DNA sequence: ATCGGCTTCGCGCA
DNA sequence: TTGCGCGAAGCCGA
């Protein structure tokens, strides 16, 4: 393993006991540098590797849809880990408390976790650090080039990150070893209980009939790879031409798996690189999963208020402020956005895509969030509404991409200045008519308009 | 220096 | 829907 995938979080004496992979972001047994490394030090100690996952209370802030997707992924993982003799333990609680204690109870010799740039994980790490004496390591298993290694600063734009990361691709883009099994020697309950809790918040149609359709994306490591393979076969070739058209099912459809780490984004790049397809489509796509994905961890990692106005660039803040008193053509409440009650059938169409498939089309997410900004009482509130709807109803939400994408859409993070307008300042503008020139808006509206049947 | 060149724009034009 | 050119606009970096 390239040792620059590892960082020390805390020194100390190695216990004579097992090596505990604190799985958190990368919920997969295959193509997992964090697990691979864990096993490897457990090989140099002749002690076994275990995996522990913290079932936290944060699931009460999103929906059954996310929770179901994830827990079902885990149930398949625990098998997959058993087949390699790697036991899988599931603590129910707060990880500061629970990881440190489990390190005590199970006499852990070394602790490894994966890398996540989100505020909460660094809170939990600092808490764990205090409550343990053993070595504590971190492995960037979610990015091709480790976040702290790709750049040491916040990147103004993709066109400054991109040389930086392409300079390290040859060293860090590589194949994955095999996960060697342990030489040395309930989840079904937790899903029922939790789903029982989330129920009175479930999004329902006027007939007690749930809104979310669960069959557009089956959860798990297995399903993820079939989605990847069916994308290389059927959709990569058209990607460059149709990635901006919401009427074509032509995206990878990988983001819900990428968020939970049910698949390695590295493996996707490995497969796509070798795929003999249209160059235009490869280059566009590598650009999204490599650059736009990893600049998002970059933003969150170097900007701890990544869900705040104050991480917008100076020009964008100064511009939005100077338009705070402009008359808005419309103002909607979070309740109104949430239910698709704006003047715009295109905007509602896209919210109905979000409510029912739990995944909104890429291009329409940009439109979606810029219109939240344009028809709410203030920047701050637009951001709140946007974040809240993103994270409540996207299978891929609560994720650095989400934040960096909302920040792109509303504060121009990683963008530039455009014509100065009412309300939205010099933020890039997107128009109903611009869409109508780019795709059959009326199809998209057709498909979802019909969901005026909400509780 | 200093100046090209930026995700994902809009819009007229052919 | 098509692609092309041009507009408006702030700032990084070779
Ligand atoms: C307002 C808003 C809101 C969101 C997002 C963007 C915007 C503008 N995105 C980012 C992007 O829209 C989303 O990753 C894709 O639409 C996911 O669908 P596919 O995987 O099919 O995309 P597609 O196959 O076209 O792209 C492949 C992968 O590239 C990455 N990617 C694509 N567009 C990106 C972008 N603009 N920024 C960062 N990475 C990008 C993702 O990892 C994605 O899975 C996001 N993404 C996410 O993971 N979680 C979220 O909650 C959101 N929410």
From TrEMBL:
Q: Which domain of life is it from?
A: Archaea
List keywords of the entry alphabetically.
Answer: Chromophore, DNA damage, DNA repair, DNA-binding, FAD, Flavoprotein, Lyase, Nucleotide-binding
GO MF annotation: an example: DNA binding
Question: Which is an annotated Pfam family here?
Answer: DNA_photolyase
Question: So where does FAD 2 get bound?
Answer: 239, 252-253, 255, 359, 390, 396, 401
Which reaction is catalysed here?
Answer: cyclobutadipyrimidine (in DNA) = 2 pyrimidine residues (in DNA)
Q: Photolyase/cryptochrome alpha/beta domain spans which residues?
A: 17-147
Entry EC no(s) = 4.1.99.3
Entry's InterPro entries? Crypto/Photolyase_FAD-like_sf, Crypto/Photolyase_N_sf, DNA_photolyase_2, DNA_photolyase_N, Photolyase_Class-2, Rossmann-like_a/b/a_fold
Q: What class of enzyme is it?
A: lyase
State the family it belongs to: Belongs to the DNA photolyase class-2 family.
PROSITE patterns, per this entry?
PHR_CRY_ALPHA_BETA (PS51645)
GO annotation terms (biological process): photoreactive repair; UV protection
Keyword set includes Lyase? yes
- Protein name as it appears in the record: Deoxyribodipyrimidine photo-lyase
Residues given in the record as FAD 1 binding sites = 239, 252-255, 288, 359, 365, 390, 396, 401
Cofactor field: coenzyme F420-(gamma-Glu)n; FAD
């Amino acid at each position: 393993m390239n040792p620059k995938r590892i960082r020390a979080l805390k020194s100390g004496k190695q216990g004579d006991g097992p090596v505990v992979y604190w799985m958190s972001r990368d919920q997969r047994a295959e193509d997992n540098w964090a697990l691979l490394f864990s096993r490897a030090i457990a090989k140099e100690a002749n002690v076994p590797v275990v995996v522990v996952f913290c079932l936290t209370d944060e699931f009460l802030e999103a929906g059954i849809r996310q929770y179901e997707f994830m827990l079902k992924g885990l149930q398949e993982l625990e098998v997959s880990l058993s087949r390699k003799k790697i036991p899988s333990f599931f603590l129910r609680g707060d990880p500061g408390e629970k990881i440190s204690r489990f390190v005590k109870d199970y006499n852990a010799g070394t602790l490894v976790t994966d890398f996540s740039p989100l505020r909460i994980k660094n809170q939990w790490i600092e808490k764990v650090i205090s409550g343990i004496s053993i070595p504590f390591f971190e492995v960037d298993a979610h990015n091709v080039v480790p976040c702290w290694e790709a750049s040491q600063k916040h990147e103004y734009a993709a066109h400054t990150f991109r040389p930086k990361l392409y300079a390290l691709l040859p060293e860090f883009l590589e194949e994955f070893p095999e996960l060697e099994p342990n030489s040395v020697t309930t989840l079904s309950d937790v899903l029922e209980t939790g789903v029982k809790a989330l129920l009175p918040e479930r999004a329902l149609l006027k007939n007690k009939d749930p809104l979310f359709e669960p069959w557009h994306f089956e959860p798990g490591e297995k399903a993820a790879k079939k989605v990847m393979e069916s994308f290389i076969a059927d959709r990569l070739d058209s990607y460059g031409a149709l990635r901006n058209d919401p009427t074509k099912n032509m995206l990878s459809n990988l983001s819900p798996y990428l968020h939970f780490g049910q698949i390695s984004s590295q493996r996707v790049v490995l497969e796509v690189e070798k795929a003999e397809s249209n160059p235009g489509s490869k280059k566009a796509f590598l650009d999204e999963i490599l650059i736009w994905k990893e600049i998002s961890d970059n933003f969150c990692y170097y900007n701890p208020g990544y869900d705040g106005f104050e991480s917008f660039p100076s020009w964008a803040k100064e511009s939005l402020n100077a338009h705070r008193n402009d008359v808005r053509s419309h103002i909607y409440t979070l309740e109104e956005f949430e239910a698709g009650k704006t003047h715009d059938p295109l905007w509602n169409a896209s919210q109905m895509e979000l409510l029912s498939t739990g995944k909104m089309h890429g291009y329409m997410r940009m439109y979606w969030a810029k219109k939240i900004l344009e028809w709410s009482e203030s920047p701050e509130k637009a951001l709140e509404i946007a974040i809240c709807l993103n994270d409540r109803y996207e299978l891929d939400g609560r994720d650095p991409n989400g934040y960096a994408g909302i920040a792109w859409s509303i504060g121009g993070v990683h963008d530039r200045a455009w014509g100065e307008r009412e309300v939205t300042g010099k933020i890039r503008y997107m128009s109903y008519e611009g869409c109508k020139r780019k795709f059959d808006v009326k199809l998209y509206i057709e498909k979802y308009s019909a969901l005026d049947k909400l509780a």
